Amino acid sequence: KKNPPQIYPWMKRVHLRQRTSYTRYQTLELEKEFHFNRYLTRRRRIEIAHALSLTERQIKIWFQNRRMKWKKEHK
Amino acid sequence: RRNFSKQASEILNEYFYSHLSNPYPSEEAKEELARKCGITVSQVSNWFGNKRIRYKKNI
DNA sequence: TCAGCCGATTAATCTTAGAG
DNA sequence: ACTCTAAGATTAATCGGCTG
């Protein structure tokens, strides 16, 4: 990929890095909480973000991604 | 899981380089390539994600 | 409204089949 | 045969359209 005839937009840098892997415990719970209730209430949202030491956005994103993963395993 | 066949890759690269202007195939072209290469649409989709990034990080 | 949902993708990473 | 590379997969986190 050393020489692209041009630098098209997609080749540009999007996203105005870090990937905080989640501990086995954290993932085990979120999962645990998922089998229980696929969607989240502002309530459950906070209590969990609390319990597992994570921001609300992370719990929100975690469930959003888990739903798409559920969608694609079909099961 | 084993890697893709020398031919499947060729097929994918052909598409990729053939479209460097927008390497984002539609779910159809993806389904198309998928069957051509004898691999899932997910596998194609992953392949393109990885291909794009690894292309960029090497410009 | 406007925060959260979907969907596709980005980018960092995990795994480990294999090019060397 | 043996070893690191990188192919292929997984998943935080982002972009953006859209609605309840």
If we measure between CA atoms, which residue out of A72, A62, A57 comes closest to residue A29? A62
DSSP state of A11: G
**CATH for the A1-75 domain, from 3.40.190.10, 3.40.50.450, 1.10.8.80, 1.10.10.60:** 1.10.10.60
If we measure between CA atoms, which residue out of A14, A10, A23, A22 comes closest to residue A65? A22
User: How far, in Å, CA of B15 to CA of B56, rounded?
Assistant: 17
Q: Supply A26's token pair.
A: 């954290």
If we measure between CA atoms, which residue out of A75, B6, A69 comes closest to residue B38? B6
End-to-end CA distance of chain B: 30
| Strand D lies under 7 A from the Cβ of residue A37 | no
User: How far, in Å, CA of A47 to CA of B3, rounded?
Assistant: 43
User: How far, in Å, CA of B41 to CA of B5, rounded?
Assistant: 16
Nearest residue (Cα to C1') for C15? B1
Give Cα separations from A26 to A2, B12, B53 (angstroms). 41, 38, 29
How crowded is residue B27: how many other Cβ atoms within 10 Å of its Cβ? 11
* Determination technique for this entry: X-ray
CATH architecture of B1-59: Orthogonal Bundle (1.10)
What's this structure's resolution in Å?
2.6
Q: Supply B32's token pair.
A: 């198309």
Query: Please, which positions of strand C sit below 7 A from a protein CB?
Result: 4-14, 17-19
User: In chain A, what residues touch B56 (CB-CB under 8 Å)?
Assistant: 1, 11
User: How far, in Å, CA of A4 to CA of A10, rounded?
Assistant: 12
Domain ranges of chain B: 1-59
Residues 6+ apart with CB under 8 A from B48: B12, B16, B23, B24, B25, B30
User: How far, in Å, CA of A52 to CA of A18, rounded?
Assistant: 19
